[model samples]
Target chain A: STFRRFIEKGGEFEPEKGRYHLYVAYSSPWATRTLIVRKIKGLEEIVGVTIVSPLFSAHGWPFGDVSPFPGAEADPFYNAQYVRDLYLRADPKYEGRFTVPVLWDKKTETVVNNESSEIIRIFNTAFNEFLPADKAAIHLYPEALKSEIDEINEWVYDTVNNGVYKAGFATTQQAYEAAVIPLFESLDRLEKILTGKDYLVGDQLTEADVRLFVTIIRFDPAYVGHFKCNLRTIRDGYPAIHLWLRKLYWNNSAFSETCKFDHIKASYYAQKNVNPTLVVPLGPIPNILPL
Target chain B: TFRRFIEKGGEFEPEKGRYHLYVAYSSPWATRTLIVRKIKGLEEIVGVTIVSPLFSAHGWPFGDVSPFPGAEADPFYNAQYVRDLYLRADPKYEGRFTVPVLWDKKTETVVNNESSEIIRIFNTAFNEFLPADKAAIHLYPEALKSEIDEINEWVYDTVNNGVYKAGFATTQQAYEAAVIPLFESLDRLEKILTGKDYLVGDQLTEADVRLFVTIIRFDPAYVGHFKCNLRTIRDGYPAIHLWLRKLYWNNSAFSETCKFDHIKASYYAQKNVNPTLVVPLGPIPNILPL
Candidate 1:
């Protein structure tokens, strides 16, 4: 929460190509949305990304030497073993959770923005000046749909996005069911909404679809078995959401390229307190079936 | 396995109206005996006494325990709990009491209780007591004994008992460990019965009868209750589905002896596994369509 700077035009943290680097973990949905936006906005070369290993310890997400996992790379700039080392360099006495989607200003030598929502918005228009007209013209949060986009994001973040965390990490059945009930309720709402429309907000795909896709994409693979969110599966229960997910994942490489089933399964199943054996389930098979 | 057993010209003899089979209709083990009794036509020669489907604090109630009509009182002594029969059989009896008891009414003692062994006994031992038509049927035929035994070994471990291992598991790892082997065994059975009618010798042997008891209760109970949701017989295994439906619809012994109400109540009512005790009503019709 400490990193509050934003990259706008002629600001302290001004928009510049090849001046911002994203420190992220592939396992995170928050970090993943930014990755998706970076791809969708054609910011792959503009904002460089370094993914930390999915492997976690007491010290948390570490950068390894040519990590065994695909997309996970060692820290190129500082050769930092752990992500916390970067946090310490940013603030010598910083004691916050070094959570990701860390947008670092290579020019300023400070964390530009650590939140995913802001990072995506920053990627949405800040770097448009340096990009080709085709990629720069793409607006995830269009002016007219801003109100609808914000409305869907609010409830979706509460009942659907963070709802899995509340349900998964719950210690009691009461605690689990409380979160799970609302979670599936929102899914029911989403299923009904997406029945006829391809996109959530407007005619074209918007921020609503981009942010929500990260959760639904991982729903069957991680949340269903690991989180005890077993009321209904997207694969078997919701045809519309399943079809929407497949369309996003298959038709667009930006969503599919950054989405890793191996990391998501490993990360969720690693919580020994929740899964004592830490023996990850094999599956409901094939991860996601052929579209 | 049990301490006492029945064999011809031994401590226990096969005589008409000289024995009764005590069982609970819901129990998988006891249902095997009930199915065997029906198939072997021992309805009259060896009478039946059904315990209530629900288990009480004392366990296996006889009368006034469950409102369910499936139960019948102990006819001979009017005993309440089934453990009383076990305690009556031995004054020092102490263990987790189970059912499908073959009682010797003549000697007035409990005889062989194991369903696997009881099915084998009912297969041919009661031939003299039964008419030629009923007695002629051999579930454990001589020609298919080895084949029956081979399939029975894996079927019992993975299918019959594998379901239990998964249901009784305390942890997710144990559940998965048991389920993977279980579904694989079903897949192998699906492979086995892909083109054949029965598991061994292309005829209904001990293998078919032993394996039938589990499949009859599978879709209704095990799929949701035991978390064996990797696949279902109807959806995942076509060959096994066809064979199971044939057994269920074609034979009265398999169909009549099988009860969904009893099976679902017995499993879901037990809070040990399903804490809510709220039975799921799903995968309707109990058995799939032909």
Candidate 2:
């Protein structure tokens, strides 16, 4: 039933040069997820990429000559001024949040998928015909552990992944206190689960670990002070969590290259609605480093 | 007081060796009495003993009859605790025996326990027997009495005592409410001092004495350590700041006796209040440029 549409079309669309493209921000861990999959799958040449600005504007992701930034260069496709313009060109009636890791099929002029989980899976198998067997052989959602991975993914998504948003964006005191306590409690449970182990589901790394890593990285620098999650700090409070984070960051190749500290710090501090003064603290530096 | 003492209406007389004074250096209230005694040239006539600047669970103390630095230790009683001297005066004294307690050594009792009462007694108690030139000063004049009391009453309650209530509050909401009012009163005082040199008319009065003690301690003690961070007195209020600098720089009696080390350590290092005893080392610059 799931492959009915793709099988009717005589197999899913094959990956070719410039056929599949990815739009991403270096600061966004969601975008970084796509980058890691692309690097591990060896699809750099097959899938062209466009990096956007980390600073979110009123129009969302504006690029200009104001500050010295890494990925502020001109868009190679339609030469669009903003990321929203690309979305409007893709589908005129698309009225939703213009988030990233959009796998654009330039030939068909339609978004293949915007969901990060689906995009990474699409990268894993659909483009494999053009690559070596070793590069395509690696699979995150293998058939054997699909049931266990599904269970871990649900718990990680509900408690850790989207838990921070529920806490920070909470409207009332009751809503804030409700979400923040569980966020730390779930983290405490996860820290216990991760001790003396290499991964979440098993000894091998999986999708569940990636989901938790993104939220934990941003916890101390921005979330602890800015979001008022000030019960404790990760460096001193959670030792097992800290050790696990350092292991993934230092060992992984794609994780280090995609993470930019300046972009992450500026994204939270420059927002006038949250912090009126826009005073960015030059502290909690070196988020995670080599042993 | 001079005519009454001459007519035998009072037992208190002006003499060199008749009275002794006990005080604590950390207290702004006690320091006022010390300044007035020095200004009236009674330092030699009236003997003195200074208590420890540090406050304990039992209150202010003395280290083997030695005074705090720049203050004379107790030379006569050699008492360790200030309460011991109070207990010596009356064995069953069932209340707080706070300094600036003026002790009558000959009568073997406290002459005056209150700060305002003791300072007034120092003003005229020995004027008849002392040199006429040294006793020429007048703080509470008949013309300024009503106006001075009116100003001092409002400022002491709302501004002086207001800062204490804010800093010592146990709740966040209470701290926020109290700190805002403290700065608002400072703003009102800034407006009052814009055109006038002194609080009650041109000449200095008792109102100036009450306000000066609180303002002098604002920056070093309250602003950072006590979380009174909305606005600093030296930075936010300009008129009060300039007025304070003039008093501190020109008047040696006010400046020399005002100990910053005692004020800072008494609040931050005291184990009961801040158990960590870790003093914050910053806002690094002492005061704004005048």
Candidate 3:
């Protein structure tokens, strides 16, 4: 009913230009997917954005209200001291995991959608009337591949996608082994599937590959070391997966421009529980082949 | 075998100023070869060169720059890197290029690179030139050959290669699996040495030498740094303790070449594993007091 109502614009909402502001974290894959959709649909000029610092402390993703770190920049808005303050201002009693990319309705000053999957779906078609004819026609969720895409997205989301966090944040050995094994098993299956195919769903690029790429790129650099998903490296172990990811990253301007290694690396190692020293490792050096 | 090689083995002869022996002071593989050369009384006959125990991104190099103390200066070619010697031997050689390479000065070529082969060469290849009493001492006796091989197999795989497998493992699963087998084999060896003096049925055979190199470096280098903390050889295993001291105290060659600073610096400085390159000064006091 929420989906149908949103599509029909039955709620007190209309797709007007310069009305929505999207907030994202360069380190967040969930945010990155929406960023990709905005780029593909040419909605950058319409949807204003604010990027928070990648480093998450106990306070968690502090906005530019405080002095910016060496590489980080400040918030553009009320210069909110923290992301939690933004959530508090919107709904003081808002009690949940404060994740990004929040699709903030600037006019109403409320979060249109915090869930990235739904936000991207909204960005996919909502502003079609205001977009260029060629850009408007570009559909991520095609009628033909909808069911198949949903099925593949479900597996990628459950096992391999969120599977990394499940494995890394696990408190017990049993919890860790149970989570990480299925991740490798899914990778093995995905590697086999991607051997002959270019994209996850079809010949064209889709949201499924975008969701998968962010985690895969971080696999060797962070997950292998920090997360203890050490069954194998994405470079050495998953050849087809590596090549497929490289294809997307190298060829696409959107993926490369948004993907930042320093942010990705700092987010994990800076955590005291994971890496006590907070000494950022020089690297397994991220792949340099134009990706 | 020294008598046989002396009587009939031609071109495999030992001559002063005719051979160069490259031995790594820190490498257990190279250390064995160096010990044999000294035991055969071939130090004067063969020129010995030592590399640093510390390994870097490019692997082992000449670490005699006080980066780690007691690192020997490159003697033979005056080369800064160990790979420089490998490149000298064969400009196109493309393997790991390990130490204990016996270079024949007469031919100006590597006699052999393998430590096992080089140790055997040192054992009897030059024995004809040595004194009769020193020459008579056989490490690889005909009576203990098969038994020595069996002990060497277990010691090499479980103790020697086991540490490497545990240290270099990229995954937690691989690391967890490796450290278990490693300590299990150590427990097996410790149990065997409880009433005996040496590893190979009480006689000072090749098995004892093989096991000693890996064990001596265990507490100082591999334990805390390499995450080989299931048990400490110095504190946890006592039988191996007595056996290790028997060799260390009784012999100068073993103790002198066993560089703790070099060993600790190597693993901690290796950027491939330890990116911070912080050499841990730990498992303090070096060794257990005898």
Measured by lDDT, the strongest candidate is: 1
Question: Which candidate achieves the best TM-score against the true structure?
Answer: 1
- How much is A128 displaced in model 2, in angstroms? 1.7
- For DockQ, the strongest prediction is 1
Best of the two (1, 2) by lDDT: 1
- How many Å off is the CA of B148 in candidate 3? 27
Rank by DockQ (best first) = 1, 3, 2
Descending-TM-score candidate ranking: 1, 3, 2
Q: Which runs of model 2 end up more than 4 angstroms from their true locations? A: A1-12, A64-68, B1-290
Instruction: Find the 10 residues in a row with the least total lDDT in model 2 chain A.
Output: A1-10
Candidate models: Cα lDDT each? 0.82, 0.68, 0.72
> Per-candidate interface C-alpha RMSD?
5.8, 14.3, 14.1
How would the docking of model 3 be graded?
incorrect
Clash pairs detected, candidate 2: B67-B73
lDDT (tens digit, per residue) of candidate 3 on B13-60: 666667776666767788887777766677777787666666655556
Per-residue CA lDDT of candidate 1, range A1-291, in tens? 678888888799888888999998878898999999999999988899998988765787878663456667989898788888888888879888888879998886778888887888888789999889999999999899999999999999998999988887776657777888888889999999999778998869898998899898888777876676656678877899988889989999999999988888878867766554454556657677678
| Deviation in Å, model 1, residue A132 alpha carbon | 2.0
For candidate 1, give the lDDT of residue B125: 77
